[PDB]
RNA sequence: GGCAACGGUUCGAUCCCGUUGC
């Protein structure tokens, strides 16, 4: 009986994302857990942690679109791109209202980019982190990103802040360093919170330390931990909110959960679709319209 | 399930996801 859910979360500062998603996997005791995206050691923020069944839905979040606030310290240069890499630049802060204002404006839409060798981009087997840290470069190609939204904050002292929504696989820090080379000063990230990912509620992201004193409660009040663990997850299915939910009553799931495609009323014409069964709209699995139009299974949650 | 090659994700995921091979 191992739990399925997404927990929302909130990052601590220095911690990898991989470190945050075993700490989360321990707490609830899974068996299985994996994060759809992750965040910076210097960052925080949401960071949906798959648990159980619900990591085979990762990929929609791992797709989705992202919101981060971040605050860029100008005229220094860091290899890393933010404040935990070496200063490799340092020049004068000189450009004007107008420019930082143009400067913005060309990262709004519909943009490229070439990430930053410190990121977990692969490159024959193993990523380019790998390589930074051997002093080695290696070719990267520019990857097409959306930026929905650039919103500017602040510019004081040496301090820029702005929020960003934009498309998976964005780097923020990318998006500071080229905008100061735009500046002719040199830029790098001292500050990186996710506000959040798709259309999850941020008001149910939670702190590591918060899960640590739930746990502490638990046991304080001898009850398991997981009465109150468990109401903080969102559904399994959630990563697949998005898409349209066919219902099968139970003597067409029979043949679905056998691996046939089946057909039913309320169905689209095509894509993707959750399916659920009987009335209780229990969710057992990603299904996708085929050429017969029918519902074909496709990712189903084990049965038991 | 598992193993491997390759790719993904905002960087110290062997660990999560995808493609292919066994």
């Given at each position: 009986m191992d739990i399925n859910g997404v927990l929302l979360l909130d990052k601590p500062q220095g911690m990898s994302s991989n470190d945050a998603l075993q700490k989360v996997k321990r707490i609830y005791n899974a068996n299985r857990a994996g994060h759809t995206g992750a965040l910076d050691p210097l960052a925080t923020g949401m960071?949906?942690?798959?648990?159980?069944?619900?990591?085979?839905?990762?990929?929609?979040?791992?797709?989705?679109?992202?919101?981060?606030?971040?605050?860029?310290?100008?005229?220094?240069?860091?290899?890393?791109?933010?404040?935990?890499?070496?200063?490799?630049?340092?020049?004068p802060v000189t450009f004007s209202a107008e420019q930082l204002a143009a400067a913005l404006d060309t990262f709004r839409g519909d943009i490229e980019q070439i990430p930053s060798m410190y990121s977990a981009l692969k490159y024959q087997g193993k990523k380019l982190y790998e390589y930074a840290r051997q002093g080695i470069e290696v070719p990267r190609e520019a990857r097409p990103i959306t930026?929905?939204?650039?919103?500017?904050?602040?510019?004081?002292?040496?301090?820029?802040?702005?929020?960003?929504?934009?498309?998976?696989?964005?780097?923020?820090?990318?998006?500071?360093?080229?905008?100061?080379?735009?500046?002719?000063?040199?830029?790098?990230?001292?500050?990186?919170?996710?506000?959040?990912?798709?259309?999850?509620?941020?008001?149910?992201?939670?702190?590591?330390?918060?899960?640590?004193?739930?746990?502490?409660?638990?046991?304080?009040?001898?009850?398991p931990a997981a009465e109150l663990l468990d109401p903080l997850l969102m559904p399994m299915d959630s990563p697949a909110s998005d898409y349209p939910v066919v219902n099968l009553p139970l003597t067409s799931s029979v043949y679905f959960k056998n691996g046939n495609?089946?057909?039913?009323?309320?169905?689209?014409?095509?894509?993707?679709?959750?399916?659920?069964?009987?009335?209780?709209?229990?969710?057992?699995?990603?299904?996708?319209?085929?050429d017969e139009g029918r519902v074909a299974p496709r990712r189903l949650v084990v049965e038991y």
């Open positions: 960071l949906p942690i798959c648990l159980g069944e619900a990591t085979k839905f990762s990929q929609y979040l791992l797709d989705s679109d992202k919101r981060y606030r971040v605050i860029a310290r100008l005229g220094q240069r860091t290899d890393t791109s933010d404040a935990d890499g070496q200063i490799v630049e340092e020049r930026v929905y939204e650039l919103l500017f904050i602040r510019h004081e002292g040496n301090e820029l802040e702005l929020e960003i929504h934009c498309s998976k696989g964005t780097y923020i820090r990318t998006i500071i360093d080229d905008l100061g080379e735009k500046l002719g000063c040199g830029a790098h990230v001292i500050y990186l919170r996710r506000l959040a990912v798709s259309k999850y509620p941020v008001e149910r992201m939670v702190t590591l330390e918060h899960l640590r004193e739930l746990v502490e409660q638990a046991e304080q009040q001898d009850i495609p089946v057909r039913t009323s309320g169905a689209p014409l095509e894509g993707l679709v959750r399916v659920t069964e009987g009335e209780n709209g229990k969710f057992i699995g990603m299904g996708e319209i085929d």
